[PDB]
Every structure is written in structure tokens, then in C-alpha cells.
Design a binder for this molecule. Structure first.
Ligand SMILES: CC(C)(COP(=O)(O)OP(=O)(O)OC[C@H]1O[C@@H](n2cnc3c(N)ncnc32)[C@H](O)[C@@H]1OP(=O)(O)O)[C@@H](O)C(=O)NCCC(=O)NCCS
Ligand SMILES: CC(C)(COP(=O)(O)OP(=O)(O)OC[C@H]1O[C@@H](n2cnc3c(N)ncnc32)[C@H](O)[C@@H]1OP(=O)(O)O)[C@@H](O)C(=O)NCCC(=O)NCCS
Ligand SMILES: CC(C)(COP(=O)(O)OP(=O)(O)OC[C@H]1O[C@@H](n2cnc3c(N)ncnc32)[C@H](O)[C@@H]1OP(=O)(O)O)[C@@H](O)C(=O)NCCC(=O)NCCS
Ligand SMILES: CC(C)(COP(=O)(O)OP(=O)(O)OC[C@H]1O[C@@H](n2cnc3c(N)ncnc32)[C@H](O)[C@@H]1OP(=O)(O)O)[C@@H](O)C(=O)NCCC(=O)NCCS
Ligand SMILES: CC(C)(COP(=O)(O)OP(=O)(O)OC[C@H]1O[C@@H](n2cnc3c(N)ncnc32)[C@H](O)[C@@H]1OP(=O)(O)O)[C@@H](O)C(=O)NCCC(=O)NCCS
Ligand SMILES: CC(C)(COP(=O)(O)OP(=O)(O)OC[C@H]1O[C@@H](n2cnc3c(N)ncnc32)[C@H](O)[C@@H]1OP(=O)(O)O)[C@@H](O)C(=O)NCCC(=O)NCCS
Ligand SMILES: CC(C)(COP(=O)(O)OP(=O)(O)OC[C@H]1O[C@@H](n2cnc3c(N)ncnc32)[C@H](O)[C@@H]1OP(=O)(O)O)[C@@H](O)C(=O)NCCC(=O)NCCS
Ligand SMILES: CC(C)(COP(=O)(O)OP(=O)(O)OC[C@H]1O[C@@H](n2cnc3c(N)ncnc32)[C@H](O)[C@@H]1OP(=O)(O)O)[C@@H](O)C(=O)NCCC(=O)NCCS
Ligand SMILES: CC(C)(COP(=O)(O)OP(=O)(O)OC[C@H]1O[C@@H](n2cnc3c(N)ncnc32)[C@H](O)[C@@H]1OP(=O)(O)O)[C@@H](O)C(=O)NCCC(=O)NCCS
Ligand SMILES: CC(C)(COP(=O)(O)OP(=O)(O)OC[C@H]1O[C@@H](n2cnc3c(N)ncnc32)[C@H](O)[C@@H]1OP(=O)(O)O)[C@@H](O)C(=O)NCCC(=O)NCCS
Ligand SMILES: CC(C)(COP(=O)(O)OP(=O)(O)OC[C@H]1O[C@@H](n2cnc3c(N)ncnc32)[C@H](O)[C@@H]1OP(=O)(O)O)[C@H](O)C(=O)NCCC(=O)NCCS
Ligand SMILES: CC(C)(COP(=O)(O)OP(=O)(O)OC[C@H]1O[C@@H](n2cnc3c(N)ncnc32)[C@H](O)[C@@H]1OP(=O)(O)O)[C@H](O)C(=O)NCCC(=O)NCCS
Ligand SMILES: Cc1cc2nc3c(=O)[nH]c(=O)nc-3n(C[C@H](O)[C@H](O)[C@H](O)COP(=O)(O)O)c2cc1C
Ligand SMILES: Cc1cc2nc3c(=O)[nH]c(=O)nc-3n(C[C@H](O)[C@H](O)[C@H](O)COP(=O)(O)O)c2cc1C
Ligand SMILES: [Cl-]
Ligand SMILES: [Cl-]
Lengths: 68, 68, 67, 68, 68, 68, 68, 68, 68, 68, 68, 67
């Protein structure tokens, strides 16, 4: 037989930067999901409070292997 | 950093128009989902019957804050 | 089994997006048969006196080809 | 001689729908700008409060003729 | 009212080609999902081993009718 | 110093696959049109009947040389 | 008014350049079509012979107002 | 620090072609803007009158170095 | 309804990285603009000198609420 | 590790179909290139003769790991 | 039942225009490469010196038949 | 006057996006001359044990062609 994958979309956030947002988001996914394989960034965004980046926001597609 | 969002995709439908289709799709999401925050229209389509629009169909991405 | 044709039109209306969509499809319906679906390609409009004179909705329209 | 146009980007908002957001945004532009000619929609979005569309948000490119 | 569709994203795989990969992914979705209506290919990819295609990988959006 | 080409859009269909759907569409185009030169796939879609692919649907742009 | 427009797709060609390719195609559309209003360039392509550009090929969408 | 660039969008027009339209728009921008560095074409369009191109219209993003 | 936003485009730059480029561009915007609300990265580019990155350059759309 | 990959672009062709076109091109890349890892389909095109598909043409990006 | 094509990317430049920039790039490609078949413009850009276009820059994809 | 070549590479790094970008350009710099610019095409990564094993940044890299 042959594997099928599922691709969900999440947004990781961090006040520090793009990498921390990515990893922040993936950690929350890892808490409940198994067989996480890859991610792809869809967009990089952020919210500004008093002229400053309050949160970096990285929208990601996340691929994991489907269990039966 | 801590907050993570989930982005699901739905198609709202209505015979009345684009707004009606958007609000009908979102309304079904609100029956089961919590902390809904935003939507984005991916496309606007429709099925035609008797040379007129039977249903407007608006495809939407919908973001909500993930609970623990 | 069936082959479909996809043509591109622009429906316009001073009232809004729905009316523009419908205005355009109705003109298509006058001459074309077996119209099945549509997809909006863009939503534009012409402005006069700083207000929307016409909403213009570019659509692709799919209909089943006859023999 | 021959005309040049300027293309700015705005987001109109309304709690009623897409058309009202478009027109809401264009009215604010008209208050200060002259020779407004066309617009194109870049995206349709919205903010959700208690499962409901609080504001429809329509990001638009707006073209106007440049004065000298 | 009038239906709302849910649109999920999966990746079908097969060593045999694009069709088999497509039918492979959908067969896994059909094991657990009801009222599957349509699919759209997002991309066609593959992993290569020793200079030959090990698996075709077809990423699909898949739309089904939501139950209450 | 001369020729102009026309580009029309069709959707070929077939229960057998992507290739069959491509050829099925082009064959209909070949019944009436002359000097067909190239095609380009715009999208691969399909309708699902109780979990299986009923019809593969391949949307194509088809280019042909215009006669005077 | 509440006019409807038709958008067709053509490829104008010329050995001289992009401009010449655009007007070559539009002239051919102008031989049969009425109320031509606008064009939009989709792509700029060409064919190479002996390491030179034999023909510039400009693919255009051409919008015209439908008569009754 | 290190510079920030501003990126504006204009439409150059000319009855003569794409180059002249491009140079036309930039000449108007250069009348009032300083430290113009680059441009990128977004689209090439035109208005048609009596079956012929009245004006070429080239939409450009234009980047200049911000002063303090 | 009433609130309207403006979306300008800027390129932040830094020799240090992507985050640094983002924050430097936004910082220049905050010196003169008020009620900044969000940004979106349009692209990530850079200039190379001596076979290394002299400056990271992140192109950003930046939205702010229009005052009366 | 901290490997770097090279992505090249090829068009595989076959009169038989899409799958056959993909593997035709990959086999030619496999005749000279080492550590081929993945491909992504960019477009599916073809040439028409006598109203039939003479050659399926699949444009692919092909990623391989750079050696030292 | 055979040929494979290679697709490389170059940027032709010229102070005279888009066409000249296209031909200038292809001529360099013609100096070393054989069986050049087509090109496609990816983007039209340019560098500005004190308000005027210094160099038009046309990025192209260039396709040629691979020899054995 | 000058013609440029645009190649596509993927720089990787377990540390982040910048390090991935730089890791990739450095490998390019080992063999290529007159490297002038880069553009990021995508940011991806491989996951192991539910954490980022490698950040992968696909880039187009422009360099001036010699004669
Ligand atoms: C609601 C939601 C955010 C909760 O996610 P979460 O809190 O992060 O984690 P979940 O509660 O989903 O738990 C993960 C589930 O996937 C399962 N799972 C984890 N990895 C898996 C994988 N590799 N393959 C198959 N199943 C897996 C877990 O066992 C668990 O299943 P269970 O609940 O049946 O025991 C998420 O499930 C979701 O967004 N679902 C979609 C909801 C939707 O489509 N909305 C409808 C509105 S119209
Ligand atoms: C199946 C499905 C259509 C049903 O959606 P629904 O009828 O709108 O409601 P659900 O059954 O998902 O219930 C909502 C869930 O979200 C959870 N929830 C709601 N809002 C949440 C939020 N803000 N954060 C975290 N969890 C939330 C609820 O607790 C509930 O979970 P539970 O039933 O396990 O306790 C939908 O969940 C779905 O499409 N998900 C799976 C699709 C899929 O990927 N299938 C794989 C086939 S290959
Ligand atoms: C700040 C801003 C939002 C204010 O806009 P507004 O309140 O809606 O209206 P403005 O204050 O701009 O007034 C319109 C101006 O354009 C002029 N104008 C109007 N239509 C015009 C047209 N057809 N052609 C030329 N000028 C025109 C008006 O005369 C007025 O000029 P003036 O201020 O020199 O007297 C807007 O000007 C803007 O976003 N500018 C860009 C700021 C920017 O780039 N940010 C830099 C941060 S890095
Ligand atoms: C977890 C997952 C991989 C498992 O998928 P699966 O093994 O193919 O099938 P599931 O276990 O989800 O079962 C499908 C569910 O949808 C329901 N269902 C099926 N078709 C439906 C439809 N047409 N309408 C409404 N509900 C439907 C089924 O009853 C079942 O619900 P149940 O588990 O409460 O009984 C998949 O559900 C998924 O990717 N969910 C989203 C997880 C997610 O978003 N993670 C968040 C991490 S941040
Ligand atoms: C109506 C339609 C679906 C029927 O297509 P079809 O049955 O496959 O083929 P047609 O009946 O059009 O026949 C093809 C025509 O093109 C001509 N033709 C074929 N190749 C040609 C060529 N390369 N150069 C010039 N003419 C050519 C044929 O001679 C024939 O013309 P004729 O019957 O007037 O002599 C199709 O023509 C179409 O989609 N037209 C556009 C419809 C439209 O835009 N409607 C607007 C609604 S708002
Ligand atoms: C066949 C074709 C190439 C011939 O085009 P052409 O030589 O440039 O011009 P045509 O022969 O179509 O003549 C132009 C038509 O448009 C009509 N016309 C022109 N402008 C019009 C306008 N503004 N509004 C309404 N009608 C208009 C003319 O009356 C004429 O039709 P007529 O022969 O009934 O008088 C072209 O019409 C075409 O590609 N049609 C579509 C073919 C198609 O879809 N095939 C499907 C294959 S599956
Ligand atoms: C109004 C507008 C059309 C007029 O443009 P214009 O006639 O070509 O030139 P302007 O009058 O704006 O003059 C350029 C300004 O930029 C300044 N400037 C020029 N180059 C600069 C640079 N490199 N860095 C910083 N400032 C610069 C000039 O000093 C001048 O400022 P000043 O008017 O305060 O003296 C144009 O400025 C515009 O589109 N602005 C945005 C309006 C807008 O966003 N509207 C909001 C409606 S909701
Ligand atoms: C010229 C420019 C670079 C200077 O930007 P800057 O140095 O960052 O600061 P500005 O000079 O724009 O000053 C900020 C303006 O925004 C206004 N403002 C700030 N935030 C605002 C907000 N939230 N809502 C409304 N107005 C606001 C300020 O009052 C000020 O206007 P004023 O100087 O007329 O009183 C910039 O304004 C610009 O690029 N605009 C014009 C570009 C253009 O379109 N030129 C046309 C050439 S064809
Ligand atoms: C010219 C070309 C078509 C010939 O390709 P080909 O026949 O398939 O194979 P080549 O002749 O290049 O040989 C493959 C090379 O890759 C090298 N190689 C293979 N896999 C490798 C890898 N994983 N890592 C590092 N090197 C590898 C081989 O050593 C061989 O080089 P060598 O001749 O020094 O031993 C192709 O190399 C090409 O298109 N090059 C680019 C041309 C170009 O950019 N022209 C610019 C015009 S302006
Ligand atoms: C290095 C480079 C810029 C030089 O290009 P150039 O000076 O215009 O041309 P080249 O020196 O490569 O000569 C073209 C080669 O392709 C061959 N060639 C030309 N047409 C061919 C064809 N259609 N089929 C097969 N080979 C062909 C030529 O014979 C010559 O090969 P040879 O010298 O080994 O006999 C170019 O080859 C290139 O961009 N290569 C890829 C660089 C790269 O990917 N670097 C990785 C850094 S991480
Ligand atoms: C000029 C044009 C807009 C007129 O459109 P219209 O007035 O709305 O409708 P038409 O005049 O084409 O009439 C509809 C045609 O489609 C046919 N038809 C309707 N539905 C059909 C379907 N489902 N399948 C096949 N044929 C169908 C009708 O029989 C009629 O053909 P007929 O005139 O030979 O009897 C025309 O359709 C068109 O845009 N064709 C293409 C123009 C073109 O390509 N020109 C090339 C310029 S270079
Ligand atoms: C295999 C490959 C990755 C090796 O890359 P590498 O090890 O990083 O560097 P190379 O081995 O190519 O060496 C760099 C070349 O570019 C040349 N060069 C460097 N900078 C240059 C520049 N600015 N302009 C022109 N030439 C340059 C060098 O002189 C050298 O050529 P040489 O080997 O003839 O002396 C190769 O460059 C490649 O990917 N080529 C294309 C592969 C291909 O198209 N194969 C077809 C398969 S179907
Ligand atoms: C993906 C693809 C794109 C092509 N684009 C063009 C084009 O834009 N213009 C053109 O004239 N020919 C185009 N062609 C046709 C090629 O020029 C064709 O392969 C060539 O003319 C055949 O000659 P050969 O014997 O060298 O292979 C394209 C072919 C393919 C496969
Ligand atoms: C915009 C464009 C796209 C093209 N795409 C392809 C293609 O994908 N595959 C191909 O083989 N030829 C392609 N071609 C080349 C055409 O097939 C070419 O115009 C034709 O073969 C020339 O024959 P003719 O005498 O009928 O004009 C393309 C040409 C143009 C202008
Ligand atoms: Cl998506
Ligand atoms: Cl933009």
C-alpha cells in the first residue's frame, strides 16, 4: 500500500520574529498531531501596536502522514 | 507568542447573493467553532439552472484562535 | 461524454456585485444554452463624481457543448 | 501631452456587506482626492465577533488621474 | 437553509502515476468522509530514488457537504 | 510578419483519467476548428459519486491559427 | 446601458517587436469585431530561429461591448 | 541606520508604445520625486478607439529612497 | 462601517537579517505615520557584495487607519 | 549536512501521456545528474497535429543535492 | 516519442527599450547555446539614474532542445 | 551591455531563515562569480520529532554573465 498525507493550515505567532513564530506554531501542532513531516509558509504578517511589531504572524501549511 | 490560529476552508452558499453566501457559511461555522476571528474570500462561483444563478457559492478561509 | 466551453464576460450594474453578476449571466442566457456554472475573475468599477457609476464583474462562464 | 495615473490602495469597511464596504471606502477617498477614475478589488475579508461578521473589509486599488 | 461545504487538503501518492495517486488519496478520504463532491489538484510532485520516480504525489483540495 | 492566433478555453472530461479527459476535449475541438496548434492545462478537477471519481475534468486553453 | 462586455483571447505576432505584435493582433480583431474597448497583455513570448527572434508573440485579452 | 524604500504605483500612458508609456509615467514621477531607483511593470493594457490603440497604459511599481 | 484603512508599500533593509529588515522599515514608518495596524511581507530579496548578503530587503505592505 | 540543493527546469515529452512525459524528462536528467530528490510540475502543455496530441509536454522543476 | 527541453532564466538589458533588452539577452544565449526554441518574459524591470531609465531589464525563461 | 543569469537553489539551516539564506548563497559563492542579488521563492522545512530539523529557503540568484 501507499501513504496519504493531510495538509492543515495554522498561524504561528511570536513577538520576536519569523523563526520563533514558525516554531511557536509547529509546537502547538506537535502537542496533538503525530507524523508531522513538512511545512510551507503561506504568508508573513504582523500586528502593530504603538508603531511596533506586537506579534509576528506566519501562516503555514503543515503536512503530516495519515494513520489508518 | 503563545497564541496559535487554525485556518479552515469552507464554501458558504445562498440563492440570494454573495453576502448571503458568506454569512450562511460563517453561521454554520459558528454553530460548532469558537473564537472565530476573521475570514478571507478565496473565490466566488455559482451553479446555474434555467439560465440563472441557483446558488451563489463563496469559498472562504476562516481563522480561529486555538484553545489549549 | 461531455465537453464544456468556458467564455469570459463582464456583467455590469450600478447597484452592486450581485446585480452585475446577474446582469451579465442574463445576457449570456439570451443566446447560450446549457449554462452550468460561473467563476468571478475580478471585481472592478468605474467612478464618476467620486462614486461608483458601475460595478463590473468579470466572469468565466461554463456551458456544455452541443454536438 | 498624455495623462499619468496614480494607484493607491485602501480598505473600505461596512457591517452590511461587500458593496457597502467598497462604497464606504471610496467615499472617504473622494473627500480629499479628485479625478477618481476606477477601482479594483484586491481582497474581501472580515473580522468576526461572537461568530458574526462585525465588519466586511474590501481592499481596493484606486486609480485617479494625476494633476500637474 | 442551503448547504455549506468543507474543503480539506490531502496528498494522494502512488508509484504508478498521476491518476492512481489521485484515486489513492480520495480512497483514503472516502474511508471516513461522507458526501464527497469534488476535488481540485493543487500541485503534482514526486520523490525520486536512484534516478527514477518512487512516488507520484498529487496535492488535492477536496470538498464535501457538511452535515448538521 | 503576419499570423494571429486565437485562444479558447474548454474542459475535456473522461471517467478514465487526466490524459483521456485531455484527448476527449481536444477531439471535440478538432471536429469544428482548424489549424489547432497547442494546448495548456489550466486545472485538473473532478466530480465524485459516493466516494469515487465519476469524471476527471481538465480545463484547457487551446490555441489555433486564425484564417483570414 | 448596464452593458455587458465580452473578453476574448488572441496572440498578436510580429518580427519587429512587442508593440508591433500587439497592434498586429488588434488589427485582426478589428477586421471583424465592433466596439473594441480595451486589451490586457497576458504574456510576452516568442519563437527563436538561428538564435534570433523570428516572431514576437503577445497574448492579449480583448474586451468589447456586446450588442443586443 | 540603513535605508528604507517607498514603493508607489502609477500608470504611464502613450499612443506610441510600451517604452514611451513607461518613460512617460516615470517622467511625471521624476518631476516631484527624488532618489528614484527602480521600477517594475505590473501590467500592460490599453484603450482602443475605432479599432486601433489610442493609448498604451503601463502600470508600474516605482521605488525610491526615503529621506529622513 | 465608518473606518477606512490605507495600505502603503515599503522596503525595509538591514545587513543583519529578515526580521531586522522588517523592523527597520516599520520603524521609519512609525516616525511619521500614526495608528499603524498591520503589515504583510510581499517579498524577500537582497543585494550581494563580495559573495555575501550586503543588505536584506523585505518589501512590506503596511496598513493604517485613516484619520478624518 | 546543511546541504544545498539545486533546482533546474526541464520539459519532458511523450506522445503517450502526462505520466510518460514526466518520466521521459526525468530519465534524461538521470543520465547526467546525481542525487536527484524531487520534481514539481510547472505546467502541462502539448503540440497538436491533424487535430490530435502529437506530444504531451510536462514542464518540471527538478531538485537535486549539490555535491562539494 | 522522445525529446527533452531545458529551460534556463536570464535577464537581457538595454538602455533603448524592452525589445532591445530582449534581443540583447537572447544574443548572449545564442553565443553558447544551440537549438534555442522559445522565450517567455517573466518580468520587465529597470534601474533609474537621476529620474531617467538607465537600463531596461527583461527577465526571460529560454527553452532549448537538449542534445543527447 | 550586461546579461544576467538567474539560477535556483535551496539553502538549508537548522537555525533559521537567515542562516538558510546565507548557507545557500555561500555554496553558490564557492563556484560562481559576480553574484549580484537574490529573491526568496519559498520558505519550507522538514519536521522531525515535531520540531524543525531544517529551514529550507528556495532562492533565485542573479549573477552577471561573463563573455
Ligand atoms: C478542533 C481542532 C482545532 C482541535 O485540534 P487540537 O486541539 O490541536 O487537537 P485535536 O483535538 O484535533 O486532536 C488530534 C486528533 O487527531 C488525531 N491524530 C493525531 N495525529 C494524527 C495523524 N497522524 N493521523 C491521524 N490522526 C491523528 C489524534 O488522535 C486526535 O484524534 P481524536 O480526537 O479522535 O482522539 C482541530 O481538530 C480542527 O480544527 N478540526 C477541524 C474542525 C473543522 O473542520 N471545523 C468545522 C467547522 S464548519
Ligand atoms: C468533520 C467536520 C466536518 C465536523 O465539523 P462540525 O460539524 O462543524 O463540528 P466538529 O465535529 O468538528 O466539532 C467542533 C470541534 O472543535 C472543537 N473546538 C471548537 N472551537 C475550538 C477552538 N476555538 N479551539 C480548539 N477547539 C475548538 C470542539 O470541541 C469540537 O471538538 P470535539 O467534537 O472533538 O469535542 C470537521 O471537524 C472536519 O471537516 N474535520 C475533519 C476533516 C478531515 O480532515 N478529515 C480527514 C479525511 S482524509
Ligand atoms: C497621509 C494620507 C493618508 C492623507 O490622505 P487624506 O487625508 O485622505 O488626504 P490628503 O491629506 O493626502 O489630501 C489630498 C492631497 O492630494 C491632493 N490631490 C487630490 N487629488 C489629486 C489629484 N487628482 N492629483 C494630484 N493631487 C491631488 C490634494 O490637493 C491634497 O494635496 P495637499 O495636501 O498638498 O494640499 C495620504 O496622503 C497618504 O497615505 N500619503 C502617503 C504617506 C506615505 O507614503 N507614508 C510614508 C511613511 S514611510
Ligand atoms: C485527525 C484526522 C487526520 C483524522 O482523519 P480521518 O482518520 O480520515 O477521519 P476522522 O477520524 O477525522 O473522522 C471523520 C469525522 O468526520 C465526520 N464526518 C464524516 N463526513 C462528514 C460530513 N460529510 N459532514 C459532517 N461530519 C462528517 C465523521 O463522523 C467523523 O467524526 P467523529 O470522529 O467525531 O466520529 C483529520 O480528522 C484531521 O486532519 N482533522 C484536523 C486536525 C487538525 O486540524 N489539527 C489541529 C492541530 S493544530
Ligand atoms: C457556439 C460554440 C460553442 C460552437 O462551437 P462549435 O460547435 O464547436 O464550432 P462552431 O459552430 O462555432 O464552428 C466553428 C466555426 O469557426 C470556423 N473556424 C474553424 N477554424 C477556424 C480558423 N482557424 N480560422 C477562422 N475560422 C475558423 C469554422 O469554419 C466555423 O465557422 P462557420 O460555421 O461560420 O463557417 C462556439 O463557437 C463558441 O463558444 N462561440 C462563442 C460563444 C460566445 O462567445 N457567446 C457569447 C455569449 S454572451
Ligand atoms: C471562428 C472565429 C475564429 C472567427 O472569427 P473572425 O473571423 O475574426 O470573425 P467572425 O467570423 O466570428 O465574425 C465576427 C462575428 O462577431 C459579430 N460581432 C462583431 N462585433 C460584435 C459585437 N460587438 N457584439 C455582437 N456581435 C458582434 C459579427 O456579427 C460576426 O458574426 P456574424 O458572422 O454572425 O455576422 C471566431 O469567431 C472564434 O474563435 N469563435 C469561437 C470558436 C469556438 O469557441 N470554438 C469552440 C470549439 S469547441
Ligand atoms: C497627492 C499626489 C497625487 C501628488 O503627487 P505629486 O504631484 O506627484 O507630488 P507631491 O505633491 O506629492 O510632492 C512629493 C512630496 O514628496 C516629497 N519627496 C520627494 N521625494 C522624496 C523622497 N525621496 N523622500 C522623502 N520625501 C520626498 C516632496 O518634498 C513632496 O513633499 P511636500 O509636498 O510636502 O513638499 C501624491 O502625493 C499621492 O498620490 N499621495 C498619496 C495620496 C493618498 O494616499 N490619498 C489618500 C486618500 S484615502
Ligand atoms: C513623500 C513621502 C515619502 C514622505 O513620507 P514621510 O517622510 O514618511 O512623512 P510624510 O511627509 O508623508 O508625513 C506624514 C503625513 O501623514 C499624515 N498622517 C500620519 N498618520 C496619519 C493617519 N493615520 N491618517 C491620516 N493622516 C496621517 C501626517 O499628518 C502627515 O501629513 P502632512 O505632512 O501633510 O501634515 C510620502 O508621503 C509619500 O511617498 N507620499 C507621496 C508619494 C506619491 O504618491 N508621489 C506621487 C509621485 S507621481
Ligand atoms: C549544457 C547542459 C544542457 C548539458 O547538460 P547534460 O548533458 O544533461 O549534463 P552535463 O553535460 O551538464 O553534465 C552534468 C554535470 O553535472 C555534474 N553533476 C551531476 N550531478 C551533480 C550534483 N549532484 N552535484 C554537483 N555536480 C553534479 C557532473 O559532474 C557534470 O559535470 P562535468 O561535465 O563537469 O562532469 C546543461 O548542463 C545546462 O543546461 N547547463 C546550463 C546552461 C546555461 O545556463 N547556459 C547559459 C546561457 S546564457
Ligand atoms: C556557467 C554559465 C553561466 C556559463 O554559460 P555560458 O558561458 O553562456 O555557456 P557555457 O560555458 O555553459 O557553454 C554552454 C555549454 O552547453 C552546451 N550546450 C549548448 N547547447 C546544448 C544543447 N542544446 N544540448 C546539450 N548541450 C548544449 C555547450 O556545448 C557547452 O558545453 P561544453 O562547453 O561543456 O562543451 C552557465 O553554464 C550556467 O549558468 N550554468 C549553471 C551554473 C550553476 O547552476 N551553478 C551552481 C552554483 S550553486
Ligand atoms: C460576437 C459574439 C459575442 C456574439 O454573441 P451573442 O450575440 O451573445 O450570441 P451568438 O450570436 O454567438 O449566438 C449564439 C451561438 O451559439 C450557439 N449555441 C448556443 N448554445 C450553445 C451550446 N450550448 N453549444 C453549442 N452551441 C451553442 C447558437 O446556436 C449560436 O450559433 P449560431 O449563430 O450559428 O446559430 C460571438 O458569440 C463571439 O464573441 N464569438 C467569438 C468572437 C471571436 O472569437 N472573434 C475573433 C476576433 S479575432
Ligand atoms: C552540476 C552543477 C550544479 C555544478 O555546480 P557547481 O559545482 O556549484 O559549480 P560548477 O561546477 O558549475 O562551476 C562553475 C562554472 O561556472 C563558471 N562561472 C562562474 N561564474 C561565472 C559567471 N559569472 N559567468 C560565466 N561563467 C561563470 C565557472 O568557470 C565554472 O565553469 P567551468 O566548470 O567550465 O570552469 C552545475 O553548475 C549545474 O547545476 N548545471 C546545470 C545542470 C543541468 O542543466 N543539467 C541538465 C540535466 S537534464
Ligand atoms: C512548454 C513549451 C512552451 C512552448 N512555448 C512556445 C512559445 O511560446 N512560442 C513558440 O513559438 N513555440 C513554443 N513552444 C514550441 C517549441 O518551440 C517547440 O518545442 C519547437 O519549436 C520544436 O522544435 P525542435 O525540433 O527543436 O524540438 C513551446 C513548447 C513547449 C514544450
Ligand atoms: C503563446 C504561444 C504559446 C505556445 N505554446 C506552445 C506549446 O505549449 N507547445 C508547443 O508545442 N508549441 C507552442 N507554441 C507554438 C505554436 O504551436 C506555433 O505557433 C505553431 O506550431 C506554428 O504553426 P502555424 O503555422 O500553424 O502557425 C506556442 C506559441 C505561442 C505564440
Ligand atoms: Cl490553499
Ligand atoms: Cl500590489
Amino acid at each position: 500500500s501507499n501513504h496519504t498525507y493531510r495538509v492543515i493550515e495554522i498561524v504561528g505567532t511570536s513577538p520576536d520574529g519569523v523563526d520563533a513564530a514558525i516554531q511557536g506554531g509547529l509546537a502547538r501542532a506537535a502537542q496533538t498531531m503525530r507524523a508531522l513531516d513538512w511545512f510551507e509558509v503561506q504568508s508573513i504578517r504582523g500586528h502593530l501596536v504603538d508603531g511596533a511589531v506586537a506579534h509576528f504572524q506566519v501562516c503555514m501549511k503543515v503536512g503530516f502522514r495519515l494513520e489508518d
